């Protein structure tokens, strides 16, 4: 048979030695670069082996402050933890802060003492399928050129499902207005004023 080091390639009608096989008996092989298997898929109800242990201060219904990322300084409500990724699933109810349903790692949030509680939140959807469904992905590599317009259409088609899952916010929004000054507190950016030393602040 062929030597383990010998991978024959087609000769473009060029000069080849007597020992080298001719073109008619050479079948080229596609270059293989991916040797590591991808992640497995388990049941939606079971938690991943790679699950973080949340801080004791972070409980469902509590209010958190986002201190990093695109929504830095905003306040949100912590519903539950994505068991398949370990990231918190928060909503700074869109009618109040404009923060949509998203996933944020627990290291970028501060757990405040203010708690909205709220049961019957109706989280029947909003799992790892939903967040992977509304993600905006690139245009691969070999998919023609498809410049510019790809992302604009993506937001339009995924917009409808985004609103559909905002039925979750219908409960917290009503409760939030019960506490005086809370709606103003939620909608306003978190700031560090003069004399606000972080090692002295308590939440």
């Amino acid at each position: 048979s062929a030597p383990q080091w010998f991978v024959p390639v087609k000769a473009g009608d060029a000069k080849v030695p007597a020992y080298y096989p001719t073109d008619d008996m050479i079948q080229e092989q596609k270059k293989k670069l991916r040797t590591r298997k991808g992640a497995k898929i388990t049941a939606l109800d079971k938690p991943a082996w790679n699950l973080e242990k949340l801080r004791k201060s972070i409980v469902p219904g509590a209010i958190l402050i986002i201190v990093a990322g695109k929504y830095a300084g905003k306040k949100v409500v912590f519903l539950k933890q994505c068991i398949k990724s370990g990231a918190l699933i928060v909503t700074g109810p869109f009618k109040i802060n404009g923060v949509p349903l998203m996933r944020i790692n627990q290291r970028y949030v501060i757990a405040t003492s203010q708690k909205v509680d709220v049961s019957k939140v109706d989280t029947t959807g909003v799992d790892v399928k939903f967040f992977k469904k509304i993600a905006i992905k690139k245009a691969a590599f070999g998919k023609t050129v498809e410049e510019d317009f790809a992302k604009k259409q993506y937001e339009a088609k995924k917009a409808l499902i985004v609103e559909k899952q905002k039925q979750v916010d219908e409960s917290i929004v009503a409760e939030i207005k019960k506490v005086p000054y809370l709606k103003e507190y939620m909608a306003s950016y978190f700031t560090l004023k003069n004399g606000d030393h972080p090692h002295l602040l308590k939440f």
Binding site: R55, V67, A68, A72, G73, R107, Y108, I110
Partner: protein, 106 residues
């Protein structure tokens, strides 16, 4: 929009009388007047954000950053040690460094 950081002064590198070790940079966080107020900041992110007057035809960003972490205190007057991805430029002594609030352990 909001202030989510505390300004720290890049005083200088870890040094001796006649030597200098630019691997570690000393910072003076505002409001930290003693080493007992340092344990909060040990581990927080620190960024040196500067501005570069780029030309119109260049695609390099006009605002670049170097990030790093506060690793240990340095002395009894609330001075910290910070190690960055790349050593800070010595032209940046006396400038302000953003001390963020994450990784949050609150």
């Amino acid at each position: 929009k909001c202030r989510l950081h505390v300004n720290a002064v890049f005083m200088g590198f870890q040094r001796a009388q006649r030597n200098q070790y630019p691997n570690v940079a000393l910072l003076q966080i505002s409001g930290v007047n003693t080493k007992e107020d340092t344990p909060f900041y040990i581990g927080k992110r620190v960024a040196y954000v500067y501005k570069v007057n780029v030309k119109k035809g260049s695609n390099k960003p006009a605002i670049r950053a170097i990030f790093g972490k506060i690793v240990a205190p340095h002395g009894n007057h609330g001075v910290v040690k910070a190690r960055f991805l790349h050593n800070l430029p010595p032209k940046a002594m006396g400038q302000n460094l953003k001390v963020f609030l994450y990784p949050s352990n609150i």
